[PDB]
Amino acid sequence: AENLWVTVYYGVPVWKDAETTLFCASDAKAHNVWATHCCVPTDPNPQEIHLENVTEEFNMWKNNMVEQMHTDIISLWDQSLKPCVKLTPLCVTLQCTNVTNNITDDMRGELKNCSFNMTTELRDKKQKVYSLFYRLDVVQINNKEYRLINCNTSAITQACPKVSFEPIPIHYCAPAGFAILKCKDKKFNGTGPCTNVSTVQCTHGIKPVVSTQLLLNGSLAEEEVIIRSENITNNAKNILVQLNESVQINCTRPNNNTRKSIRIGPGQWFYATGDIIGDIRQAHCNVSKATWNETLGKVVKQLRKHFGNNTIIRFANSSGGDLEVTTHSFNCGGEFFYCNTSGLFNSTWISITLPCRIKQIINMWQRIGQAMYAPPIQGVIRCVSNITGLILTRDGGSTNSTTETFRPGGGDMRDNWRSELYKYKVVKIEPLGVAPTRCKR
């Protein structure tokens, strides 16, 4: 008997979960690939709005913003290499020796001096050239004859020696008709409701840093070490540990290198690794022992919280597989390091020097079919970075509560973005609605 009449409202504050494409924006201030694909500037003072009395459900494991970074990053890598010189002509039988001059025993057998016959700019003329190679990229044919490691598998191209891939913070912004909501609540699990939310135009700046086992240069939690997982009980899943204190790691490549330019064709140059100046030493990373053996103690108390009150926690080494899986894949200065992390996970709870290997022909994790040759860096390099989180894998689940074993794990590229896109959700705005009122035309 209410006698009401369906009035119509437009501009109603109602939203629904949705999937759309986000666009990148930058600080303007930033030959770097992300300085060109992230041209639109963000507002210097983002218009964040607190929403009073709003409860919203989040789930970081089903967040499509993560999938978009994966696609955008691999897409750019495959565009940047588009105009550059192919190294197909270098897939020739090589003649190699052992580079034994001024070598540290740790480097014995690591470098090879290889000579070969390759063409010049003229179709009818050849030249004899030589360069140094790392053993990881050179494979013996049937003791002096060697092939490049990927000749029976993939095409090889030279990375453009002009384009920087140094991470730049980028921001993702919503398209018209959409909005991004953020959790500002505390100690968020990564899933479930949060009751302290706000509306934003764009995400905070996120650096597209890619690494394995250890997560570098991210957001450093806030109040405590937080451990997140899709399931925790299921030993097939990863555990992401976010630290509230950073651990400084110092990595270096001690050998002083030079370069030589070899004509590979008309207007096409190949960049080869030249002689090492001075002694030949092994690449490595330094982690302060005084910080690491405390950082894990914090992790253990929080890790025990999910398994038991009086149980033993053991940190073991990594398992078998490719270097991309078993080691810490670290990209720094333009070269690719594969570091041994066993020295960091060798203890039971109840200065550390890590040796590294260097690889130049990179079959990027992203796909099989094409490989990239990374030109050498002149002089020497040093890297300073922040370990901000760990990826652990549970290697137990067995019927013995006495103890449980964790190992370095991960390796999925998305594990490096999921932890930053963690606080955000994309929604669509739907402006029409109806409701009864006591008024008719």
């Binding site: 009401l4 369906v6 109602v14 759309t20 060109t36 694909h37 009395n53 008709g177 409701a435």
Partner: protein
Amino acid sequence: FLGFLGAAGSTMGAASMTLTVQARNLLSCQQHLLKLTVWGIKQLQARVLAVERYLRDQQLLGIWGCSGKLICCTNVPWNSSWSNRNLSEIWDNMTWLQWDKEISNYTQIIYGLLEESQNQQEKNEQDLLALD
């Protein structure tokens, strides 16, 4: 962008005062897009969609006889079966998100009725002795 969603936790009645805040925000390089013609398309698709969504809502307000208005009355009676609540339970102590969840299944019934009502109104305007 001074409240794009500020009224989300407000009651349905109170939130009726921000309709221009939400409406004005729903229809907000150089060489890169043409050198790499993947991105020119990705960007255009986002822009075309924002326009199409805007226009579909405007067409409905036109058909229902509510063009140019943010608040509009109709002559379709409210069915008690759509929500058995009185006005003091709807306009106060309830948000628009909650209301939308409650009504959802009846959205198409209501929209169909709004279109029928406007057509009947037009028929009555082609008879100079109408409504007497």
